[PDB]
């Protein structure tokens, strides 16, 4: 009835900041890596209700270009991350998105994340390109910095609000 558990997965290319977004959200710190068993949790509040976010970092899946069924199983939300300094990470979004289409529950919320927003001297992908990609595919989008915490809390909380309100 009254308390909630939302399973999240974090997906996207190598080095986009999946691990750092996890650690920033759960521990408020920015930095070992146990592939296949790399996770964290944090309690939040939406509409006065207690919601436990159980969050899975899918590092190690990148080489496969696909997410194992056990990550998708019961996943309520997914953060699909690219690295704004590396256009190739932006280019591979459609293949991550198709993997999710084929193998995830259609109700799984997906938020598009352009990470490393602090790195303005190396930006390759404009914020507007992330926005347009998200619109075309019916997703919410935010730029984050796992380094500075910018929009990190907002990304996880807004995903949860979308899951809860759907
Ligand atoms: N400046 C900056 N560096 C970041 C950010 N997120 C991650 N990094 C750096 O990028 C590297 C890769 O991030 P990581 O979380 O390990 O990527 P992953 O393979 O997707 O898990 C890290 O070692 C950090 O040095 C960010 O928001 N800003
Ligand atoms: Mg990782």
Curated annotation (Swiss-Prot):
Range within the parent protein: 2 to 170 of 212
Principal localisation: endoplasmic reticulum
Modified residues (N-acetylalanine): 1
Location relative to the cell: Endoplasmic reticulum-Golgi intermediate compartment membrane; Melanosome; Endoplasmic reticulum membrane; Golgi apparatus membrane
Gene that specifies this protein: RAB2A
Modifications after synthesis and translation: Prenylated. Prenylation is required for association with cellular membranes.
Membrane topology summary: Lipid-anchor
Needed cofactors: Mg(2+)
Motif Switch 2 in this chain: 59-68
Keywords (A to Z) from UniProt: Acetylation, Cytoplasmic vesicle, Endoplasmic reticulum, ER-Golgi transport, Golgi apparatus, GTP-binding, Hydrolase, Lipoprotein, Magnesium, Membrane, Metal-binding, Nucleotide-binding, Prenylation, Protein transport, Transport
Self-association state and partner proteins as the record states: Interacts with PRKCI. Interacts with TRIP11. Interacts (in GTP-bound form) with GARIN1B. Interacts (GTP-bound) with HOPS complex component VPS39; interaction contributes to obtaining a functional HOPS complex that promotes autophagosome-lysosome membrane fusion driven by STX17-SNAP29-VAMP8. In contrast with mouse ortholog, not able to interact with VPS41.
Protein function: The small GTPases Rab are key regulators of intracellular membrane trafficking, from the formation of transport vesicles to their fusion with membranes. Rabs cycle between active GTP-bound and inactive GDP-bound states. In their active state, drive transport of vesicular carriers from donor organelles to acceptor organelles to regulate the membrane traffic that maintains organelle identity and morphology.
Assigned protein family: Belongs to the small GTPase superfamily. Rab family.
Amino acids binding GTP: 15-20, 34, 60, 115-116, 118, 146-147
Residues the entry annotates as binding Mg(2+): 19, 34, 57
Segments carrying motif Switch 1: 33-38
Domain notes: Switch I, switch II and the interswitch regions are characteristic of Rab GTPases and mediate the interactions with Rab downstream effectors. The switch regions undergo conformational changes upon nucleotide binding which drives interaction with specific sets of effector proteins, with most effectors only binding to GTP-bound Rab.
GO MF term (any one): G protein activity
Regulation (activators, inhibitors): Regulated by guanine nucleotide exchange factors (GEFs) which promote the exchange of bound GDP for free GTP, GTPase activating proteins (GAPs) which increase the GTP hydrolysis activity, and GDP dissociation inhibitors (GDIs) which inhibit the dissociation of the nucleotide from the GTPase.
Catalytic activity: GTP + H2O = GDP + phosphate + H(+)
Top-level EC class: hydrolase
The organism's place on the tree of life at top rank: Eukaryota
Protein name per Swiss-Prot or TrEMBL: Ras-related protein Rab-2A
Originating organism: Homo sapiens
GO cellular component: acrosomal vesicle; autophagosome membrane; cytosol; endoplasmic reticulum membrane; endoplasmic reticulum-Golgi intermediate compartment membrane; extracellular exosome; Golgi apparatus; Golgi membrane
Region of interest (Required for interaction with PRKCI), ranges: 1-18
EC number(s) recorded for this UniProt protein: 3.6.5.2
